[PDB]
Every structure is written in structure tokens, then in C-alpha cells.
Ligand binder design. Sequence first.
Ligand SMILES: CO[C@H]1CC[C@@H]2C[C@H]1[C@@H](OC)CN2S(C)(=O)=O
Length: 281
Amino acid sequence: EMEKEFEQIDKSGSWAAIYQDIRHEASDFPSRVAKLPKNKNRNRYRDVSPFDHSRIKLHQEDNDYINASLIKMEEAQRSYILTQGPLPNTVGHFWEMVWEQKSRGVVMLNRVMEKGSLKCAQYWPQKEEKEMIFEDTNLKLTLISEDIKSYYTVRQLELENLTTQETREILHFHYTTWPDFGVPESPASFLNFLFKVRESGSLSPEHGPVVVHCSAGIGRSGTFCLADTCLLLMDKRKDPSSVDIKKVLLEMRKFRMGLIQTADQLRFSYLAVIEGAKFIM
Ligand SMILES: CO[C@H]1CC[C@@H]2C[C@H]1[C@@H](OC)CN2S(C)(=O)=O
């Protein structure tokens, strides 16, 4: 059981050690499309690339590339699109991807500015009456409503395909309180946030995959998907304690590199799953 494995790693201070074995065992697949010179300005970080096999393709004939990966968790019956925070030049591609994949929710785990630098373009409208038009992808985005709470904001948005005049409602879940350095002290508000996303229906098989991002789409974004998938597997299985976090993380890492960036994020993921298991047993 992970709770006892947790106390062992904690009492022995072996988190950096566990973390390094995960780094060592992690899959390495080609990412040739990401490295083409015509895609250099579509990547926020030169060392964070989607694998070719799992990359999301845009349905535009010119250049189909976006820094985004499909993570397919077969046993849990959950999919997630993990992507980078959009760049000034990729905001239109981001919303095209949301449209094309039939996503119902966007999960944002960063602030636009952290540590005095911009981690993400402002890719949604700040006021009802000031909508955004993405001329490159022929989409219009309107803020419908915004509910600001202490640890997160939920926004209703309307996305309109200007080409076909179809509209969809998108939910934007913005976790606003992740600290600039380290991880939250308690996983309580993160779990509350994850249960709010689940309650919305955004993670349900009726819809396309949820879009999850932070700045790189690997660290906080990884913690989100890893906690959700582990808790779902504990509900589904005859024996809940057969769930090995390290194995689930490695299975996820076949689909996108570098998920869980620090030993701190790994420790936090264990804590979130252990605590969430109480609210699920
Ligand atoms: C990064 O913050 C935490 C993460 C977990 C702990 C303590 C500390 C790390 O020290 C930088 C080392 N690990 S540890 C002892 O398990 O190797």
C-alpha cells in the first residue's frame, strides 16, 4: 500500500532516488515533427516536445503542428490532451484544437505571470463585451460568465466557428493558487478543484478529451492527470491497493515526456492520491 510506501520514502528521504529511477525507466520516442525548423516558433521550450506517435494534429493543410499530446489511459477509460501554455502566435491554433477535438473543458494550472515572467499568453477574454476573434483559425470566443473563488476561477465561454456559425460552450477551470516555488502544503484545495472538474462532465467519455496545461504542459499538468487516473483506477479495481503510482506515471510517460518535473511534484502526487482515497473509501 502506497501510504506505507509514502512513510518509507519520507522517513528514508529517498524521493530524489525514486524520482531518478522513473527518469531512467521513462520511454524515449522520436519527436521529429516538433524539431522541424518551420515549427521552432510553435514551441515555448526547446527541450519539451510531443512524441510523433501521440501528437495532436491540427486539421489545417498548411502546418498541422501544435505542442500537444493525447494521453490515453485504456484501463481507466480516460483521455487527456496535455499542451503548453499558448504563445502569442499559437492562441488561434489552441482554440482550433479545442474545436477539432470536441473538448468541453480547459484546465489551466498556472498564472499568466509567475516569477516576474510571462508563462502563457492571455488566450481568453477578460470582459463579456470584449470578445476575441482569431483571424488565422476563423473562431470567435466570448466570456459568458466568471465565478471567482479563493483557490480557483471557473469561466463559461462560447466558442463560435465563424465558418459554419456552430457554437459550443467551453468551461475554463483556472487553478490560481499554485505557488511560484514548490508545491501546495496541503492537497485539499487541489482535490476540491479536481472534483469540480469531474462534476462538470468535462472528463466524461461523451465529450472529447479535456485540455490540460501549465507553462510546459508536463509538471503541474502531469500531477493533475496522474491524481485523476490513480483515483479512478482505485474505484474500478477489485483490490484498490494494486494501484502503483510509479507504474501509472511510467504508462503516462509513453505519451508525453517529462510528466512530473521534480521529486516534490512526485511526493505531492502521492499525498493527493492518498488523501483523495479517503474521500473515495
Ligand atoms: C525538493 O524538496 C524536497 C523533496 C522531497 C525530499 C526533501 C526535499 C528534497 O531536497 C531538495 C529531497 N527529498 S528527499 C530527502 O526525499 O531526497
